[PDB]
Amino acid sequence: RDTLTYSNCPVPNALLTASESGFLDAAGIELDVLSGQQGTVHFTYDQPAYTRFGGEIPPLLSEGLRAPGRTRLLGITPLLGRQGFFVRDDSPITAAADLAGRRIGVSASAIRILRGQLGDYLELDPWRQTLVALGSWEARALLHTLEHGELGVDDVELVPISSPGVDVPAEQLEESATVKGADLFPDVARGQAAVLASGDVDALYSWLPWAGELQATGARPVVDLGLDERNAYASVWTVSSGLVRQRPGLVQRLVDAAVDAGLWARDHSDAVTSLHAANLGVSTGAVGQGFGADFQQRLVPRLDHDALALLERTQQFLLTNNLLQEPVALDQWAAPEFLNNSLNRHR
């Protein structure tokens, strides 16, 4: 078995599907989940045989600011589902306009972006720059939400809180060599529910299957952003550049497995929901809510122009907010030959 280091991200994707359903093993490949908790002191993307299929912000910063060329983009899969600023079911807030003067719990990272005060960003180290940039999820979601009430950032009270994936890095929320994802991911929704229940803040940002579990406790989004694609993100599948250069045959087998798993997913929707649910430690209903209706039909990786435009939109938000100086050349980052060759087997 060819072994690749890996990070299990909480987004719907064909790599996890291939690994969990048997396609990867059939391709002679196995994934070795990385354990990169604080103390690792090493940038994951710099590993020689590392692959990840998840949020695009960290890879965009790695390619656009820190170390261009370390990874190649194999494919994209959109992400959109239950998303928004949740409030207690019995909260007096029922419309976006009601957020005026209310306490909006957000990460310190999101506050820096929302106030346009990045302070020590450019001269900040790579991992911390990334943590700041991850505040983008809350920041863009809040701006979009406030538009519905014709409100501005100055019309609400921003309260610093811990946001999953931002203050608590993914390295502490994803499966490790000794800890399963089901024993770290679920706690997040319970924590968000506890924060809202305490009434210490009026609203907080939730998405992914976390939002599904959170809404089950009664909480509700002021504005459900999952209904508008301007809130979607482009999950990106990356692999170490060295692997593409030295072992294209292995990379081709890897992509073929994911493509085949994506095709298989179309005929095994429930199975796909379950494997994602089992790895997150959440209910199947939460997965459906967090990842969207029929997401199981859209897992074959993409590099078409609409997918690239989605990824471009995310980096444009980073650029507009000075989280990036210049845009990543997406086309050159991509290694389109693999996905194309893979799809050609079925054409």
mmCIF file with all atom_site columns, N, CA, C and O in Angstrom, residues 12-23 77 256-276 293-301 346:
data_model
loop_
_atom_site.group_PDB
_atom_site.id
_atom_site.type_symbol
_atom_site.label_atom_id
_atom_site.label_alt_id
_atom_site.label_comp_id
_atom_site.label_asym_id
_atom_site.label_entity_id
_atom_site.label_seq_id
_atom_site.pdbx_PDB_ins_code
_atom_site.Cartn_x
_atom_site.Cartn_y
_atom_site.Cartn_z
_atom_site.occupancy
_atom_site.B_iso_or_equiv
_atom_site.pdbx_formal_charge
_atom_site.auth_seq_id
_atom_site.auth_comp_id
_atom_site.auth_asym_id
_atom_site.auth_atom_id
_atom_site.pdbx_PDB_model_num
ATOM 1   N N  . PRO A 1 12  ? -18.119 17.760 2.748   1.00 0.00 ? 12  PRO A N  1
ATOM 2   C CA . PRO A 1 12  ? -18.460 16.572 1.959   1.00 0.00 ? 12  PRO A CA 1
ATOM 3   C C  . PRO A 1 12  ? -17.422 16.421 0.853   1.00 0.00 ? 12  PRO A C  1
ATOM 4   O O  . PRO A 1 12  ? -17.130 17.382 0.148   1.00 0.00 ? 12  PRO A O  1
ATOM 5   N N  . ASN A 1 13  ? -16.856 15.228 0.699   1.00 0.00 ? 13  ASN A N  1
ATOM 6   C CA . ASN A 1 13  ? -15.842 15.040 -0.331  1.00 0.00 ? 13  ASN A CA 1
ATOM 7   C C  . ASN A 1 13  ? -15.624 13.587 -0.741  1.00 0.00 ? 13  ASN A C  1
ATOM 8   O O  . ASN A 1 13  ? -15.871 12.657 0.032   1.00 0.00 ? 13  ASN A O  1
ATOM 9   N N  . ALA A 1 14  ? -15.133 13.408 -1.965  1.00 0.00 ? 14  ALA A N  1
ATOM 10  C CA . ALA A 1 14  ? -14.899 12.083 -2.530  1.00 0.00 ? 14  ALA A CA 1
ATOM 11  C C  . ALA A 1 14  ? -13.692 11.329 -1.976  1.00 0.00 ? 14  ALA A C  1
ATOM 12  O O  . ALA A 1 14  ? -13.627 10.105 -2.095  1.00 0.00 ? 14  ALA A O  1
ATOM 13  N N  . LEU A 1 15  ? -12.734 12.040 -1.382  1.00 0.00 ? 15  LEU A N  1
ATOM 14  C CA . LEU A 1 15  ? -11.560 11.362 -0.830  1.00 0.00 ? 15  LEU A CA 1
ATOM 15  C C  . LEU A 1 15  ? -11.961 10.555 0.397   1.00 0.00 ? 15  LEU A C  1
ATOM 16  O O  . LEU A 1 15  ? -11.589 9.387  0.526   1.00 0.00 ? 15  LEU A O  1
ATOM 17  N N  . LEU A 1 16  ? -12.714 11.177 1.299   1.00 0.00 ? 16  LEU A N  1
ATOM 18  C CA . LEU A 1 16  ? -13.180 10.483 2.494   1.00 0.00 ? 16  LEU A CA 1
ATOM 19  C C  . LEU A 1 16  ? -14.069 9.329  2.045   1.00 0.00 ? 16  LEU A C  1
ATOM 20  O O  . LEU A 1 16  ? -13.965 8.212  2.552   1.00 0.00 ? 16  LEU A O  1
ATOM 21  N N  . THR A 1 17  ? -14.944 9.609  1.084   1.00 0.00 ? 17  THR A N  1
ATOM 22  C CA . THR A 1 17  ? -15.853 8.593  0.567   1.00 0.00 ? 17  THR A CA 1
ATOM 23  C C  . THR A 1 17  ? -15.077 7.402  0.005   1.00 0.00 ? 17  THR A C  1
ATOM 24  O O  . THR A 1 17  ? -15.409 6.247  0.283   1.00 0.00 ? 17  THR A O  1
ATOM 25  N N  . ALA A 1 18  ? -14.039 7.680  -0.781  1.00 0.00 ? 18  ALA A N  1
ATOM 26  C CA . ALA A 1 18  ? -13.227 6.614  -1.364  1.00 0.00 ? 18  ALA A CA 1
ATOM 27  C C  . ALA A 1 18  ? -12.532 5.789  -0.279  1.00 0.00 ? 18  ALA A C  1
ATOM 28  O O  . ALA A 1 18  ? -12.481 4.562  -0.354  1.00 0.00 ? 18  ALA A O  1
ATOM 29  N N  . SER A 1 19  ? -11.996 6.471  0.725   1.00 0.00 ? 19  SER A N  1
ATOM 30  C CA . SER A 1 19  ? -11.304 5.795  1.817   1.00 0.00 ? 19  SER A CA 1
ATOM 31  C C  . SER A 1 19  ? -12.241 4.897  2.623   1.00 0.00 ? 19  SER A C  1
ATOM 32  O O  . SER A 1 19  ? -11.934 3.729  2.881   1.00 0.00 ? 19  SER A O  1
ATOM 33  N N  . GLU A 1 20  ? -13.387 5.451  3.002   1.00 0.00 ? 20  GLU A N  1
ATOM 34  C CA . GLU A 1 20  ? -14.375 4.747  3.814   1.00 0.00 ? 20  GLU A CA 1
ATOM 35  C C  . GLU A 1 20  ? -15.150 3.632  3.118   1.00 0.00 ? 20  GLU A C  1
ATOM 36  O O  . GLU A 1 20  ? -15.605 2.692  3.775   1.00 0.00 ? 20  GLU A O  1
ATOM 37  N N  . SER A 1 21  ? -15.294 3.723  1.800   1.00 0.00 ? 21  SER A N  1
ATOM 38  C CA . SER A 1 21  ? -16.062 2.727  1.052   1.00 0.00 ? 21  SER A CA 1
ATOM 39  C C  . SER A 1 21  ? -15.251 1.604  0.409   1.00 0.00 ? 21  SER A C  1
ATOM 40  O O  . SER A 1 21  ? -15.826 0.634  -0.083  1.00 0.00 ? 21  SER A O  1
ATOM 41  N N  . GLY A 1 22  ? -13.930 1.740  0.396   1.00 0.00 ? 22  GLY A N  1
ATOM 42  C CA . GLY A 1 22  ? -13.096 0.702  -0.186  1.00 0.00 ? 22  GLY A CA 1
ATOM 43  C C  . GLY A 1 22  ? -12.405 1.027  -1.497  1.00 0.00 ? 22  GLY A C  1
ATOM 44  O O  . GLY A 1 22  ? -11.538 0.272  -1.940  1.00 0.00 ? 22  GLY A O  1
ATOM 45  N N  . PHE A 1 23  ? -12.766 2.140  -2.129  1.00 0.00 ? 23  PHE A N  1
ATOM 46  C CA . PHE A 1 23  ? -12.149 2.507  -3.402  1.00 0.00 ? 23  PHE A CA 1
ATOM 47  C C  . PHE A 1 23  ? -10.653 2.793  -3.300  1.00 0.00 ? 23  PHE A C  1
ATOM 48  O O  . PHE A 1 23  ? -9.887  2.426  -4.197  1.00 0.00 ? 23  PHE A O  1
ATOM 49  N N  . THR A 1 77  ? -14.911 20.825 -4.784  1.00 0.00 ? 77  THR A N  1
ATOM 50  C CA . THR A 1 77  ? -16.264 20.385 -4.468  1.00 0.00 ? 77  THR A CA 1
ATOM 51  C C  . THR A 1 77  ? -16.887 21.505 -3.642  1.00 0.00 ? 77  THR A C  1
ATOM 52  O O  . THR A 1 77  ? -16.367 21.881 -2.591  1.00 0.00 ? 77  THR A O  1
ATOM 53  N N  . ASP A 1 256 ? -8.397  8.581  -9.552  1.00 0.00 ? 256 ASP A N  1
ATOM 54  C CA . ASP A 1 256 ? -9.340  7.618  -10.124 1.00 0.00 ? 256 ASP A CA 1
ATOM 55  C C  . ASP A 1 256 ? -10.237 7.063  -9.022  1.00 0.00 ? 256 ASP A C  1
ATOM 56  O O  . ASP A 1 256 ? -11.438 6.891  -9.221  1.00 0.00 ? 256 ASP A O  1
ATOM 57  N N  . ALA A 1 257 ? -9.646  6.783  -7.861  1.00 0.00 ? 257 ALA A N  1
ATOM 58  C CA . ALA A 1 257 ? -10.395 6.243  -6.728  1.00 0.00 ? 257 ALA A CA 1
ATOM 59  C C  . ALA A 1 257 ? -11.466 7.218  -6.257  1.00 0.00 ? 257 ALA A C  1
ATOM 60  O O  . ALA A 1 257 ? -12.589 6.818  -5.963  1.00 0.00 ? 257 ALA A O  1
ATOM 61  N N  . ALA A 1 258 ? -11.111 8.499  -6.179  1.00 0.00 ? 258 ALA A N  1
ATOM 62  C CA . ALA A 1 258 ? -12.050 9.526  -5.739  1.00 0.00 ? 258 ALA A CA 1
ATOM 63  C C  . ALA A 1 258 ? -13.161 9.711  -6.762  1.00 0.00 ? 258 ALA A C  1
ATOM 64  O O  . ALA A 1 258 ? -14.326 9.857  -6.402  1.00 0.00 ? 258 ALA A O  1
ATOM 65  N N  . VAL A 1 259 ? -12.795 9.723  -8.038  1.00 0.00 ? 259 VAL A N  1
ATOM 66  C CA . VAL A 1 259 ? -13.785 9.881  -9.096  1.00 0.00 ? 259 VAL A CA 1
ATOM 67  C C  . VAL A 1 259 ? -14.747 8.697  -9.074  1.00 0.00 ? 259 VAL A C  1
ATOM 68  O O  . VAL A 1 259 ? -15.963 8.871  -9.174  1.00 0.00 ? 259 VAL A O  1
ATOM 69  N N  . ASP A 1 260 ? -14.208 7.491  -8.924  1.00 0.00 ? 260 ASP A N  1
ATOM 70  C CA . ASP A 1 260 ? -15.060 6.307  -8.886  1.00 0.00 ? 260 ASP A CA 1
ATOM 71  C C  . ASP A 1 260 ? -15.950 6.314  -7.651  1.00 0.00 ? 260 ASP A C  1
ATOM 72  O O  . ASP A 1 260 ? -17.100 5.880  -7.710  1.00 0.00 ? 260 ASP A O  1
ATOM 73  N N  . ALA A 1 261 ? -15.425 6.815  -6.536  1.00 0.00 ? 261 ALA A N  1
ATOM 74  C CA . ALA A 1 261 ? -16.210 6.881  -5.306  1.00 0.00 ? 261 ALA A CA 1
ATOM 75  C C  . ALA A 1 261 ? -17.323 7.914  -5.472  1.00 0.00 ? 261 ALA A C  1
ATOM 76  O O  . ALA A 1 261 ? -18.427 7.739  -4.955  1.00 0.00 ? 261 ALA A O  1
ATOM 77  N N  . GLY A 1 262 ? -17.025 8.990  -6.200  1.00 0.00 ? 262 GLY A N  1
ATOM 78  C CA . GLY A 1 262 ? -18.013 10.031 -6.430  1.00 0.00 ? 262 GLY A CA 1
ATOM 79  C C  . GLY A 1 262 ? -19.155 9.535  -7.299  1.00 0.00 ? 262 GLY A C  1
ATOM 80  O O  . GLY A 1 262 ? -20.309 9.906  -7.090  1.00 0.00 ? 262 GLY A O  1
ATOM 81  N N  . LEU A 1 263 ? -18.834 8.697  -8.279  1.00 0.00 ? 263 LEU A N  1
ATOM 82  C CA . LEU A 1 263 ? -19.850 8.135  -9.164  1.00 0.00 ? 263 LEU A CA 1
ATOM 83  C C  . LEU A 1 263 ? -20.704 7.146  -8.369  1.00 0.00 ? 263 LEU A C  1
ATOM 84  O O  . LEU A 1 263 ? -21.933 7.119  -8.492  1.00 0.00 ? 263 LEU A O  1
ATOM 85  N N  . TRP A 1 264 ? -20.032 6.342  -7.552  1.00 0.00 ? 264 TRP A N  1
ATOM 86  C CA . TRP A 1 264 ? -20.676 5.347  -6.695  1.00 0.00 ? 264 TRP A CA 1
ATOM 87  C C  . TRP A 1 264 ? -21.627 6.036  -5.713  1.00 0.00 ? 264 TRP A C  1
ATOM 88  O O  . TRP A 1 264 ? -22.724 5.546  -5.438  1.00 0.00 ? 264 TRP A O  1
ATOM 89  N N  . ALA A 1 265 ? -21.195 7.177  -5.186  1.00 0.00 ? 265 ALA A N  1
ATOM 90  C CA . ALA A 1 265 ? -21.990 7.940  -4.228  1.00 0.00 ? 265 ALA A CA 1
ATOM 91  C C  . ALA A 1 265 ? -23.392 8.271  -4.750  1.00 0.00 ? 265 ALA A C  1
ATOM 92  O O  . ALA A 1 265 ? -24.351 8.324  -3.981  1.00 0.00 ? 265 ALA A O  1
ATOM 93  N N  . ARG A 1 266 ? -23.510 8.489  -6.055  1.00 0.00 ? 266 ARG A N  1
ATOM 94  C CA . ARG A 1 266 ? -24.801 8.814  -6.652  1.00 0.00 ? 266 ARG A CA 1
ATOM 95  C C  . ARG A 1 266 ? -25.835 7.707  -6.456  1.00 0.00 ? 266 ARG A C  1
ATOM 96  O O  . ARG A 1 266 ? -27.031 7.981  -6.333  1.00 0.00 ? 266 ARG A O  1
ATOM 97  N N  . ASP A 1 267 ? -25.374 6.461  -6.423  1.00 0.00 ? 267 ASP A N  1
ATOM 98  C CA . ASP A 1 267 ? -26.276 5.327  -6.259  1.00 0.00 ? 267 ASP A CA 1
ATOM 99  C C  . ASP A 1 267 ? -26.344 4.809  -4.827  1.00 0.00 ? 267 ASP A C  1
ATOM 100 O O  . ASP A 1 267 ? -27.056 3.844  -4.548  1.00 0.00 ? 267 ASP A O  1
ATOM 101 N N  . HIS A 1 268 ? -25.614 5.454  -3.923  1.00 0.00 ? 268 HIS A N  1
ATOM 102 C CA . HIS A 1 268 ? -25.584 5.036  -2.521  1.00 0.00 ? 268 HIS A CA 1
ATOM 103 C C  . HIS A 1 268 ? -25.657 6.239  -1.589  1.00 0.00 ? 268 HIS A C  1
ATOM 104 O O  . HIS A 1 268 ? -24.851 6.388  -0.669  1.00 0.00 ? 268 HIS A O  1
ATOM 105 N N  . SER A 1 269 ? -26.649 7.089  -1.832  1.00 0.00 ? 269 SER A N  1
ATOM 106 C CA . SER A 1 269 ? -26.846 8.308  -1.058  1.00 0.00 ? 269 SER A CA 1
ATOM 107 C C  . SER A 1 269 ? -26.846 8.106  0.458   1.00 0.00 ? 269 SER A C  1
ATOM 108 O O  . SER A 1 269 ? -26.121 8.792  1.175   1.00 0.00 ? 269 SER A O  1
ATOM 109 N N  . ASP A 1 270 ? -27.652 7.170  0.952   1.00 0.00 ? 270 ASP A N  1
ATOM 110 C CA . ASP A 1 270 ? -27.704 6.940  2.393   1.00 0.00 ? 270 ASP A CA 1
ATOM 111 C C  . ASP A 1 270 ? -26.364 6.498  2.972   1.00 0.00 ? 270 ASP A C  1
ATOM 112 O O  . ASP A 1 270 ? -25.986 6.929  4.062   1.00 0.00 ? 270 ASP A O  1
ATOM 113 N N  . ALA A 1 271 ? -25.652 5.637  2.252   1.00 0.00 ? 271 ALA A N  1
ATOM 114 C CA . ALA A 1 271 ? -24.354 5.156  2.715   1.00 0.00 ? 271 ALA A CA 1
ATOM 115 C C  . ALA A 1 271 ? -23.389 6.332  2.845   1.00 0.00 ? 271 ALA A C  1
ATOM 116 O O  . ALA A 1 271 ? -22.604 6.415  3.794   1.00 0.00 ? 271 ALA A O  1
ATOM 117 N N  . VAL A 1 272 ? -23.453 7.242  1.880   1.00 0.00 ? 272 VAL A N  1
ATOM 118 C CA . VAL A 1 272 ? -22.591 8.414  1.883   1.00 0.00 ? 272 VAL A CA 1
ATOM 119 C C  . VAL A 1 272 ? -22.917 9.312  3.076   1.00 0.00 ? 272 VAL A C  1
ATOM 120 O O  . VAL A 1 272 ? -22.019 9.852  3.724   1.00 0.00 ? 272 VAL A O  1
ATOM 121 N N  . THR A 1 273 ? -24.202 9.471  3.372   1.00 0.00 ? 273 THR A N  1
ATOM 122 C CA . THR A 1 273 ? -24.598 10.295 4.509   1.00 0.00 ? 273 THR A CA 1
ATOM 123 C C  . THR A 1 273 ? -24.009 9.691  5.783   1.00 0.00 ? 273 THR A C  1
ATOM 124 O O  . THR A 1 273 ? -23.438 10.397 6.612   1.00 0.00 ? 273 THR A O  1
ATOM 125 N N  . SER A 1 274 ? -24.134 8.374  5.918   1.00 0.00 ? 274 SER A N  1
ATOM 126 C CA . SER A 1 274 ? -23.638 7.674  7.099   1.00 0.00 ? 274 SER A CA 1
ATOM 127 C C  . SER A 1 274 ? -22.132 7.741  7.312   1.00 0.00 ? 274 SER A C  1
ATOM 128 O O  . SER A 1 274 ? -21.682 7.948  8.434   1.00 0.00 ? 274 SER A O  1
ATOM 129 N N  . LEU A 1 275 ? -21.345 7.566  6.256   1.00 0.00 ? 275 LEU A N  1
ATOM 130 C CA . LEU A 1 275 ? -19.902 7.615  6.446   1.00 0.00 ? 275 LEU A CA 1
ATOM 131 C C  . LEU A 1 275 ? -19.459 9.016  6.867   1.00 0.00 ? 275 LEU A C  1
ATOM 132 O O  . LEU A 1 275 ? -18.521 9.161  7.648   1.00 0.00 ? 275 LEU A O  1
ATOM 133 N N  . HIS A 1 276 ? -20.131 10.050 6.367   1.00 0.00 ? 276 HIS A N  1
ATOM 134 C CA . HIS A 1 276 ? -19.773 11.405 6.773   1.00 0.00 ? 276 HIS A CA 1
ATOM 135 C C  . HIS A 1 276 ? -20.223 11.613 8.222   1.00 0.00 ? 276 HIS A C  1
ATOM 136 O O  . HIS A 1 276 ? -19.492 12.184 9.033   1.00 0.00 ? 276 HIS A O  1
ATOM 137 N N  . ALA A 1 293 ? -29.163 19.354 0.431   1.00 0.00 ? 293 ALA A N  1
ATOM 138 C CA . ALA A 1 293 ? -29.995 18.349 -0.211  1.00 0.00 ? 293 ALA A CA 1
ATOM 139 C C  . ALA A 1 293 ? -29.291 17.726 -1.407  1.00 0.00 ? 293 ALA A C  1
ATOM 140 O O  . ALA A 1 293 ? -28.823 18.426 -2.306  1.00 0.00 ? 293 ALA A O  1
ATOM 141 N N  . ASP A 1 294 ? -29.231 16.399 -1.405  1.00 0.00 ? 294 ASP A N  1
ATOM 142 C CA . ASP A 1 294 ? -28.595 15.637 -2.472  1.00 0.00 ? 294 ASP A CA 1
ATOM 143 C C  . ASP A 1 294 ? -27.122 15.962 -2.702  1.00 0.00 ? 294 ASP A C  1
ATOM 144 O O  . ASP A 1 294 ? -26.639 15.883 -3.829  1.00 0.00 ? 294 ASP A O  1
ATOM 145 N N  . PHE A 1 295 ? -26.397 16.315 -1.645  1.00 0.00 ? 295 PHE A N  1
ATOM 146 C CA . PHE A 1 295 ? -24.979 16.609 -1.820  1.00 0.00 ? 295 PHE A CA 1
ATOM 147 C C  . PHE A 1 295 ? -24.272 15.341 -2.301  1.00 0.00 ? 295 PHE A C  1
ATOM 148 O O  . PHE A 1 295 ? -23.210 15.408 -2.925  1.00 0.00 ? 295 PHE A O  1
ATOM 149 N N  . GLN A 1 296 ? -24.876 14.187 -2.016  1.00 0.00 ? 296 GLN A N  1
ATOM 150 C CA . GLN A 1 296 ? -24.307 12.896 -2.402  1.00 0.00 ? 296 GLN A CA 1
ATOM 151 C C  . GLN A 1 296 ? -24.226 12.714 -3.914  1.00 0.00 ? 296 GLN A C  1
ATOM 152 O O  . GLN A 1 296 ? -23.507 11.842 -4.403  1.00 0.00 ? 296 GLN A O  1
ATOM 153 N N  . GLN A 1 297 ? -24.974 13.530 -4.649  1.00 0.00 ? 297 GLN A N  1
ATOM 154 C CA . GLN A 1 297 ? -24.986 13.457 -6.106  1.00 0.00 ? 297 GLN A CA 1
ATOM 155 C C  . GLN A 1 297 ? -23.908 14.331 -6.727  1.00 0.00 ? 297 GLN A C  1
ATOM 156 O O  . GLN A 1 297 ? -23.649 14.241 -7.927  1.00 0.00 ? 297 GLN A O  1
ATOM 157 N N  . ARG A 1 298 ? -23.275 15.165 -5.908  1.00 0.00 ? 298 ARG A N  1
ATOM 158 C CA . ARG A 1 298 ? -22.284 16.106 -6.408  1.00 0.00 ? 298 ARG A CA 1
ATOM 159 C C  . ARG A 1 298 ? -20.878 15.963 -5.830  1.00 0.00 ? 298 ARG A C  1
ATOM 160 O O  . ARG A 1 298 ? -20.206 16.963 -5.566  1.00 0.00 ? 298 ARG A O  1
ATOM 161 N N  . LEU A 1 299 ? -20.419 14.729 -5.663  1.00 0.00 ? 299 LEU A N  1
ATOM 162 C CA . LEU A 1 299 ? -19.093 14.508 -5.101  1.00 0.00 ? 299 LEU A CA 1
ATOM 163 C C  . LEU A 1 299 ? -17.971 14.219 -6.098  1.00 0.00 ? 299 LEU A C  1
ATOM 164 O O  . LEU A 1 299 ? -16.807 14.141 -5.705  1.00 0.00 ? 299 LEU A O  1
ATOM 165 N N  . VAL A 1 300 ? -18.288 14.043 -7.378  1.00 0.00 ? 300 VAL A N  1
ATOM 166 C CA . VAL A 1 300 ? -17.204 13.832 -8.336  1.00 0.00 ? 300 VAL A CA 1
ATOM 167 C C  . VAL A 1 300 ? -16.467 15.171 -8.349  1.00 0.00 ? 300 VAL A C  1
ATOM 168 O O  . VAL A 1 300 ? -17.077 16.210 -8.599  1.00 0.00 ? 300 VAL A O  1
ATOM 169 N N  . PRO A 1 301 ? -15.154 15.168 -8.059  1.00 0.00 ? 301 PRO A N  1
ATOM 170 C CA . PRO A 1 301 ? -14.369 16.409 -8.044  1.00 0.00 ? 301 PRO A CA 1
ATOM 171 C C  . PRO A 1 301 ? -14.498 17.185 -9.349  1.00 0.00 ? 301 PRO A C  1
ATOM 172 O O  . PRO A 1 301 ? -14.670 16.594 -10.419 1.00 0.00 ? 301 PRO A O  1
ATOM 173 N N  . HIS A 1 346 ? -14.462 7.055  -18.194 1.00 0.00 ? 346 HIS A N  1
ATOM 174 C CA . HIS A 1 346 ? -15.905 6.870  -18.241 1.00 0.00 ? 346 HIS A CA 1
ATOM 175 C C  . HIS A 1 346 ? -16.587 7.601  -19.397 1.00 0.00 ? 346 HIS A C  1
ATOM 176 O O  . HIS A 1 346 ? -17.814 7.635  -19.463 1.00 0.00 ? 346 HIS A O  1
#
